[PDB]
């Protein structure tokens, strides 16, 4: 199957694959807030173009697109866009999340007139919409190609409001599941401070876990990750139902994703607070949602002062970046993803194949130290070769632009340059 030994050598040779897609840089335009999803030989992609500042510039265009991932005969995956939609008020669309089912990608987004709902939570009126796009659109054949739906029925249980929160979800049967987050008033949050793991942490106080379940210690809301379920069999009015994540290894609600690998679902949750080691695992149950988190000791993420990479003591912290990983071998629990090789700055993307306690092999994605942020990795088989596609949000030196780049990385089946007659003997 795959190379399962640690290898210091050069068995990973990533390739750039965005040149076939309409991601076209222009001086003075920043390309931000990207999403990538890959399922069943199709993909979904989104970004926001801003004129000027990536955070304060003029929203120019929100791209929401779908397409095909093809083997054109050269035994590599190539990406071609088939269907693009742009909303007329791009500044109001936030936190899109894409899930594939049969003919379509369904993309669930938040609609907001007060900016990012995470930063303006009390002032955001809950408003969700869905854009449905055919992956292979057809002439005449109305309503099929593109369909916009405002969601009117949301079942949110005890949460004051809910929102998609992560790049991509899964289908099971005819039910869609999007990574999501629920906003619960801090006063209603039940948490026992004695369970906060401070045992061998000299400067951590028992209140630290509960305080860092919102974006600051005095936030009106705490954030809880979960799923938004959309059963397509029901028909008629769309009903989204929120499913909260169980409280084993609970961290602040954060961008997440759920995906199928080798026939079962898997979950990644970004580490946006004091528990900085990577959070991913097989999903035990989807509803209620419970994840069997790996005890991973080698993959972390960069932070800032209080919660830097490899920090494990509870602190009051809202820091980190989304850098997911994709399970490629369940028997040996081996995963592939891009991590940022830096302690307190978002820098230096490295593609790595790793187990719980050891990185097997890895390659830097840039030739010198480079600012990079969110990374999203999805893997699949081409015939019987494991390929991964990784989106990397990056500062691009060539044209002096912030933009997503897409790499394709073939996972080696053989560990070694040669067979090695010493170890095997005659």
């Amino acid at each position: 199957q795959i190379c399962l030994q640690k290898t210091t050598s050069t068995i990973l040779k990533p390739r750039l694959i965005s040149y076939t897609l309409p991601i076209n840089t222009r001086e003075g335009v920043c390309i931000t807030d990207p999403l990538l999803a890959v399922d069943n030989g199709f993909f979904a992609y989104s970004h926001l173009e801003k004129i000027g500042s990536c955070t304060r510039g003029i929203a120019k265009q929100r791209i929401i697109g779908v397409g095909e991932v093809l083997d054109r005969g050269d035994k590599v995956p190539s990406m071609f866009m088939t269907n693009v939609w742009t909303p007329p008020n791009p500044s109001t669309i936030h936190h899109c999340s894409s899930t594939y089912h049969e003919d379509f990608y369904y993309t669930l987004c938040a609609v907001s007139h007060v900016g990012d709902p995470i930063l303006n939570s009390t002032s955001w009126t809950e408003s969700l919409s869905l854009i449905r796009l055919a992956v292979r659109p057809k002439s005449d054949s109305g309503d099929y190609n593109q369909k916009y739906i405002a969601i009117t029925k949301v079942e949110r249980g005890k949460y004051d409001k809910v929102m998609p929160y992560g790049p991509s979800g899964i289908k099971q049967g005819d039910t869609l599941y999007f990574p999501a987050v629920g906003f619960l008033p801090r006063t209603e949050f039940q948490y026992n401070d004695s369970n906060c793991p401070i045992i061998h942490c000299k400067y951590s106080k028992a209140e630290n876990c509960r305080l860092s379940m919102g974006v600051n210690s005095k936030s009106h809301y705490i954030l809880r990750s979960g799923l938004l379920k959309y059963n397509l069999s029901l028909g008629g009015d769309i009903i989204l139902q929120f499913i909260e994540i169980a409280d084993n290894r609970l961290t602040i609600g954060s961008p997440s994703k759920i995906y199928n690998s080798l026939g079962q679902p898997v979950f990644y949750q970004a580490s946006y607070s004091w528990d900085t080691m990577i959070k991913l695992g097989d999903v035990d149950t989807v509803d209620p949602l419970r994840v069997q988190w790996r005890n991973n000791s080698v993959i972390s993420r960069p932070g800032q002062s209080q919660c830097p990479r490899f920090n494990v003591c509870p602190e009051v912290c809202w820091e980190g970046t989304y850098n997911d990983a994709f399970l490629i071998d369940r028997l040996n629990w081996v995963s592939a993803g891009v991590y940022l090789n830096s302690n307190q700055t978002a820098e230096n993307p490295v593609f790595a194949v790793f187990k719980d306690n050891e990185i097997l092999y890895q390659v830097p994605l840039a030739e010198d130290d480079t600012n990079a942020q969110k990374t999203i990795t999805d893997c699949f088989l081409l015939e019987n070769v494991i390929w991964c596609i990784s989106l990397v949000e990056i500062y691009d030196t060539g044209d002096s632009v912030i933009r997503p780049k897409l790499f394709a990385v073939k996972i080696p089946a053989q560990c070694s340059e040669s067979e090695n007659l010493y170890f095997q003997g005659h």
Epitope: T10, K13, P14, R15, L16, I17, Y19, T20, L21, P22, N24, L70, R72, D74, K75, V76, S78, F80, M81, V363, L365, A366, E367, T397, G398, A408
Partner: antibody
């Protein structure tokens, strides 16, 4: 199989421009990525740019931006390369070639000679 | 930016083995591809992905890449092997193809 047939030789004065064609047959025109590469005498090969007609937005190295214009015509399944402000040092054979594997070229066109002289 | 260095010329007699080199800083980390070009002709791909052979290319053409040196080795060289051999990589930093200077192979037939 894809094959690439280029236009014939051209003789040009310095300061003029020239438009070279690359007819693509076989394959699927919109999804082929056609690159241009020139070979000057006594010098290696030099990459000049590319286009994928489904995107229809060419890109070039900074050297050739502003002097090289690449376009695609799906009605004739032809890719064009126009080099303006010709100089003596633009005398070379220009090849088109199809990108494979996101990394190499196969096949190549037969090449077009461009001689620039006063 | 990135530079590939090739020896300008090599001479081998028929039946012998010709070994063409292509040097680059940590070229072993990139995929190296090889083309054969005869005078007045278009280049022809003879090796891709360091060591793989396209259809129609004989088993005598072999490729290796490691460290700072990639190699194209032609076994039992015929007269019809006379050509200029170019190595090539794709530089992910600049997002451009880079070619070696080419190595002129002469068969003393």
């Amino acid at each position: 199989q894809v094959q690439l047939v280029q236009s014939g030789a051209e003789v040009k004065k310095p300061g003029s421009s020239v438009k070279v064609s690359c007819k693509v047959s076989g394959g699927i025109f919109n999804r082929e990525t056609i690159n241009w590469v020139r070979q000057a005498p006594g010098q290696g090969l030099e990459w000049m740019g590319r286009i994928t007609p489904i995107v229809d937005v060419p890109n070039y190295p900074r050297k050739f931006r502003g002097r090289v214009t690449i376009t695609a015509d799906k009605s004739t399944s032809t890719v064009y390369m126009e080099l303006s402000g010709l100089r003596f040092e633009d005398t070379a054979i220009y090849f088109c070639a199809r990108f494979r594997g996101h990394n190499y070229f196969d096949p190549w066109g037969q090449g077009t000679l461009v001689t620039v002289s006063s | 930016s990135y530079v590939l260095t090739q020896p300008p010329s090599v001479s081998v007699a028929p039946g012998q083995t010709a070994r063409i080199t292509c040097g680059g800083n940590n070229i072993g980390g990139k995929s190296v591809h090889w083309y054969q070009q005869k005078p007045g002709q278009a280049p022809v791909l003879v090796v891709y992905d360091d060591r793989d052979r396209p259809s129609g290319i004989p088993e005598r053409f072999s490729g290796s890449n490691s460290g700072d040196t990639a190699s194209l080795t032609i076994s039992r060289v015929d007269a019809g092997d006379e050509a200029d051999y170019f190595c090539q990589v794709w530089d992910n930093a600049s997002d451009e193809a880079v070619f070696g200077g080419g190595t002129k192979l002469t068969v003393l037939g």
